[PDB]
Amino acid sequence: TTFTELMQQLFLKLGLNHQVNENDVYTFEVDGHIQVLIACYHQQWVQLFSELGADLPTNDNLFGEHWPAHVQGRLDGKPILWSQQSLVGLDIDEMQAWLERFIDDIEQRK
Amino acid sequence: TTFTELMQQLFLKLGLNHQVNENDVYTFEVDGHIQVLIACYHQQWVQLFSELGADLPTNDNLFGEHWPAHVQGRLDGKPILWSQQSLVGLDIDEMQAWLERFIDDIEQRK
Ligand SMILES: [Pt+2]
Ligand SMILES: [Pt+2]
Numbered sequence: 001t002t003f004t005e006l007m008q009q010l011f012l013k014l015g016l017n018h019q020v021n022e023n024d025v026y027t028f029e030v031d032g033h034i035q036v037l038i039a040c041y042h043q044q045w046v047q048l049f050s051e052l053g054a055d056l057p058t059n060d061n062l063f064g065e066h067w068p069a070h071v072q073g074r075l076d077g078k079p080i081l082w083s084q085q086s087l088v089g090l091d092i093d094e095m096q097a098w099l100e101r102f103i104d105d106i107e108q109r110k
Numbered sequence: 111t112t113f114t115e116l117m118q119q120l121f122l123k124l125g126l127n128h129q130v131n132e133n134d135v136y137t138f139e140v141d142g143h144i145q146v147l148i149a150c151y152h153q154q155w156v157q158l159f160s161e162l163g164a165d166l167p168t169n170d171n172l173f174g175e176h177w178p179a180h181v182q183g184r185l186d187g188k189p190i191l192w193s194q195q196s197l198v199g200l201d202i203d204e205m206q207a208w209l210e211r212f213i214d215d216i217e218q219r220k
Contacts, residue, residue: 041174041177042177044177045177045178047173060183060184060185061171061181061182061183061184062183062184062185062190062192063157063181063183063192063194064151067151067152067154067155068155068194069181069194071171071173071179071181072171073170073171073172073173074170074171074172075170075172080172082172082173084173084178084179085196086195086196086198086199088196088198088199089196089198089199
């Protein structure tokens with residue numbers, strides 16, 4: 001199905017409150033300090049995004065730890081974490097696991 | 111089809127010589143200075159890998175420039191570039207374009 005269908009089914013299932021902006025980007029907060037953005041690009045890629053605060057900028061950024069990989073980047077000089085995967089074949093179960101996995105990773109870093 | 115089917119069809123089409131090792135990793139050289147490794151992990155992910163020499167380690171590593179993204183990492187303190195995408199939905203045409211695109215990117219950096 002489309003990104004929104006997936007997104008809806010996702011939040012409507014996990015009973016989590018969400019926030020969609022004008023550009024069609026979903027946001028969900030973990031506890032009270034973790035914000036995760038989820039957008040779809042070019043009708044194929046699902047992007048995850050979350051800020052890290054003032055984490056250890058020294059990250060080798062190799063693939064292997066996660067599938068897909070969690071990449072640490074520099075935005076506004078400020079540390080961020082992102083993950084991407086194609087929509088094709090993406091089921092609600094994989095979506096949930098990927099998120100949990102990304103959420104988990106965020107905490108361990110912050 | 112499987113990774114190998116794809117891989118074969120790829121090299122057998124572009125008329126490029128290749129080299130498969132013991133771990134089932136394909137290698138292809140561009141001109142005489144560019145080596146690209148292609149492996150499949152967990153029967154789902156196709157990984158691209160190539161060394162950069164002594165490039166500018168200062169890379170923000172944001173998504174957006176390419177789909178999928180070309181990530182710059184540190185392996186053995188030495189700069190590398192990688193890209194990953196799921197096998198599902200992956201056709202020989204996308205494979206070729208992704209490679210060309212990765213190859214291109216390597217050159218511009220080295
Ligand atoms: Pt597009
Ligand atoms: Pt596996």
